Design a binder for these strands. Structure first.
Lengths: 207, 213
DNA sequence: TTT
C-alpha cells in the first residue's frame, strides 16, 4: 500500500495550488485521507483530511482556502489551496490517516509559490583573532546560485547558506568567510556569484 | 490553533537516554489519548514511531516509548543509536476533526564535543540602504549540536515580523552554521536606537547588537 | 455524513 503526490512544483502567486495523491496496492473505500505540509527547514502543519464517505475537515486557519476531494474512479484524492503566496511554499505530503494516526506518507512534493520571472541577483557586501565577511546575494529567481571566493582559490572558512524565499517571490542567500583580522585591507576577498538561469555573473570585492 | 511546544534540541551520546516533551492544552494533548510521534530523517517523509500516547507500530524498536503527564506528552529513546539522529514531531487530535503538530525537536547522537556558536551581526550595507532596502544579517557559525533558537530585538523589545532563519547546515569542518535575516525599511532601521540578534544554544545565550552609524 |  502506497501514496504518492503528483502535480506542479511551481505555482504563481494569488493562484490555486493543486495536487493529487494516487493510492496504489489499496483502495480508498475506508479511512481518512490527509494533506500535511512542511515549509523548507520548518515544522509540519496539518492541512486537512477527507473521510472515505466524503466528509471534509480542514485546519481552522486554512479553512476558507482548502478543498480536499475524493476521486474514486482513479483511486485518488486531491488538494486545492487557493490564494497562495510565498508563505505557502512548502513540501506537501499526502498521508493515510487510520485509527488516530498518520501511517503511510507519500515522498512529498516541494511547491514553490512565486510569479517571479527570471531575475539576476543584487550582490551586497557584508563588511568586516578572526573576522567574518561575506556577500548577501539578493532578489534572484529561480534557484540555483553558486558562490565561490577568489575564483575558487579560497575555500577554508567559507560557508554558503541555503536560500530563503522572501514574501516578494524572490530568493536571497548569504555566503561568508572567516579570515584572519590581520589580513584585512591587504588580502582581497572577492565573492564570485554565478546565476545561470539569468545568464549573470557578479564579482564583488568586500572590504 | 497553536502548535504543540517542543524543545528545539535534545542530545545524548550513544547508549544514553533522551526525553522529548510536547506541551499542548486541555483541548488537545490533555483532552484525548490520541497522541502520535513521527521521526523525520533529512529529505524523507515523516514515519510514525508511537500512536495512542504509548503504543508502538510493528517494526518500531522497543527503545522508543511514549508517555503523557497533564498536557505534556513525552517521547523517550533509550540506548541511543547513531541512526536515531533525526527530527521528531508529536501530533495530537485537537477536537472537532482537527490535528495539530508540534514544533519539532532535533535529536543529536553526540559524536563531537559541543561547540559554542560564534555570532556576527552585520548591519545594512550603505549600498543596500541606497537601494532603499535594509537587511540585518545574523551569522551563526561553528556550533554543535546543530540546533539553535534565534530571537530578534529592537531597543530590547522582541521583533517577530520580517524574520527569516535558515535551518542549521554542516560546514566543511563538520560543525554547524545558521543564518537569520531581519528585513526592514531604511526608515525603520534609522528610527530605532539599537537592534539585537539573540542566539540560544544548549542553555547558553549569545547576544550581538548593532546601531545606525 | 466522518476513527
Amino acid at each position: 500500500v502506497q501514496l504518492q503526490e503528483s502535480g506542479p512544483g511551481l505555482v504563481k502567486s494569488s493562484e490555486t495550488l493543486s495536487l493529487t495523491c494516487t493510492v496504489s496496492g489499496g483502495s480508498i473505500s475506508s479511512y481518512f485521507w490527509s494533506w500535511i505540509r512542511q515549509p523548507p527547514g520548518k515544522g509540519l502543519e496539518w492541512i486537512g483530511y477527507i473521510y472515505y464517505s466524503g466528509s471534509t475537515n480542514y485546519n481552522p486557519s486554512l479553512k476558507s482556502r482548502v478543498t480536499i476531494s475524493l476521486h474514486t474512479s482513479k483511486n485518488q484524492f486531491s488538494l486545492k489551496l487557493s490564494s497562495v503566496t510565498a508563505a505557502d511554499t512548502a513540501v506537501y505530503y499526502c498521508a493515510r490517516h487510520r485509527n488516530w494516526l498518520f501511517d503511510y506518507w507519500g515522498q512529498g512534493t516541494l511547491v514553490t509559490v512565486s510569479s517571479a520571472s527570471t531575475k539576476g541577483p543584487s550582490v551586497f557586501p557584508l563588511a568586516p583573532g578572526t573576522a567574518a565577511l561575506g556577500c548577501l546575494v539578493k532578489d534572484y529567481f529561480p534557484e540555483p546560485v553558486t558562490v565561490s571566493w577568489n575564483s575558487g582559490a579560497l575555500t577554508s572558512g567559507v560557508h554558503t547558506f541555503p536560500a530563503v524565499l522572501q514574501s516578494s517571490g524572490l530568493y536571497s542567500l548569504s555566503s561568508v568567510v572567516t579570515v584572519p583580522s590581520s589580513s584585512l585591507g591587504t588580502q582581497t576577498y572577492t565573492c564570485n556569484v554565478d546565476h545561470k538561469p539569468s545568464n549573470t555573473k557578479v564579482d564583488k570585492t568586500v572590504e | 490553533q497553536s502548535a504543540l511546544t517542543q524543545p528545539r534540541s535534545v542530545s545524548g551520546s550513544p547508549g544514553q537516554s533522551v526525553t522529548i516533551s510536547c506541551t499542548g492544552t486541555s483541548s488537545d494533548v490533555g483532552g484525548y489519548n490520541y497522541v502520535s510521534w513521527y521521526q523525520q530523517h533529512p529529505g524523507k517523509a515523516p514515519k510514525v514511531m508511537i500512536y495512542d500516547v504509548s503504543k508502538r507500530p510493528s517494526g518500531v524498536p522497543d527503545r522508543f516509548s511514549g508517555s503523557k503527564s497533564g498536557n505534556t506528552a513525552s517521547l523517550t529513546i533509550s540506548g541511543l543509536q547513531a541512526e536515531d539522529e533525526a527530527d521528531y514531531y508529536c501530533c495530537s487530535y485537537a477536537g472537532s476533526y482537527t490535528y495539530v503538530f508540534g514544533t519539532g525537536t532535533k535529536v543529536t547522537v553526540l559524536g563531537q564535543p559541543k561547540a559554542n556558536p560564534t555570532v556576527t551581526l552585520f548591519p545594512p550595507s550603505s549600498e543596500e540602504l541606497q537601494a532603499n532596502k535594509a537587511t540585518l544579517v545574523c551569522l551563526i557559525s561553528d556550533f554543535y549540536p546543530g540546533a539553535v533558537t534565534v530571537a530578534w530585538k529592537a531597543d530590547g523589545s522582541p521583533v517577530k515580523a520580517g524574520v527569516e532563519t535558515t535551518k542549521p547546515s554542516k560546514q566543511s569542518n563538520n560543525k554547524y552554521a545558521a543564518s537569520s535575516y531581519l528585513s526592514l525599511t531604511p526608515e525603520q532601521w534609522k528610527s530605532h536606537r539599537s537592534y539585537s540578534c539573540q542566539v540560544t544554544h544548549e542553555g547558553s545565550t549569545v547576544e550581538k547588537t548593532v546601531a545606525p552609524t
